[PDB]
From Swiss-Prot:
Swiss-Prot/TrEMBL cofactor(s): Ca(2+)
Enzyme class label: hydrolase
Catalysed reaction, written as an equation: Hydrolysis of keratin, and of other proteins with subtilisin-like specificity. Hydrolyzes peptide amides
Peptidase S8 domain mapped to chain residues: 7-279
Cofactor annotation comment: Binds 2 calcium ions per subunit.
Function, as annotated: Hydrolyzes keratin at aromatic and hydrophobic residues.
Full-protein positions shown: 106 to 384 of 384
Name by which UniProt lists this protein: Proteinase K
Active-site residues, Swiss-Prot/TrEMBL: D39, H69, S224
Amino acid sequence: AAQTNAPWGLARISSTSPGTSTYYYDESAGQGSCVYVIDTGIEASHPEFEGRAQMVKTYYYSSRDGNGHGTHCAGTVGSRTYGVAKKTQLFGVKVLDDNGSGQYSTIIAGMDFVASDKNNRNCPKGVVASLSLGGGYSSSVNSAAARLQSSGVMVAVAAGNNNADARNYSPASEPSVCTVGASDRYDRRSSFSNYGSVLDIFGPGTDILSTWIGGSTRSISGTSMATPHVAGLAAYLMTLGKTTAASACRYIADTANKGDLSNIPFGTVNLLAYNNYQA
């Protein structure tokens, strides 16, 4: 399938080259998979989600996304226009308040929530969790991420926006999950992107168009935007049968565009997420 005048990032992870604007992907489009978006919520009513988004948990007075961030990430995962995996099922877990902040205890609870809740969902093609959040190093946060992964969920987490080594942030620094840095439309490392040996992969993160609350759209930047590209890609590839929740990060690294990014510090992977789709 081909989506013309796609957002650049969608075009990028189906291309061996930057600078194109059509997204190509297998029409299965992640159908039968599920991706949890652990964030500020999701505006499920957005036309862009087509009935495939739902809130399943909140820790606050509402499960509505009063921020927009979680809605944007969800859109990159699976919205009809802005999403990688255009037929996945999207589940919102609001660990972050409408100001975009959250206690680590709450985030940890959300992670263990997802590890259990998947057993209450129909996801025959597999389960992904996307975590466009983080703060300073916490072993208990990492451990929760590792449990969720261990439980059979493909965990994708943002590297962070400090232009520093991701080793000092959680859950970025958890080795067993898939830590995602950010790149721009010219295949440069995003200016803010964290780096380091604990990065697994890069995805598009600068000037990423997606859904926003109030039925809207906007372009923003962050490793928060890169993470759901990889989360969606995982779900898409699991639906294709190509990989599993346990092996998808590795598979994505294996099949990445290699050596194409600039300003990747020595010791950091030079791998850009790529669906290897050939129509």
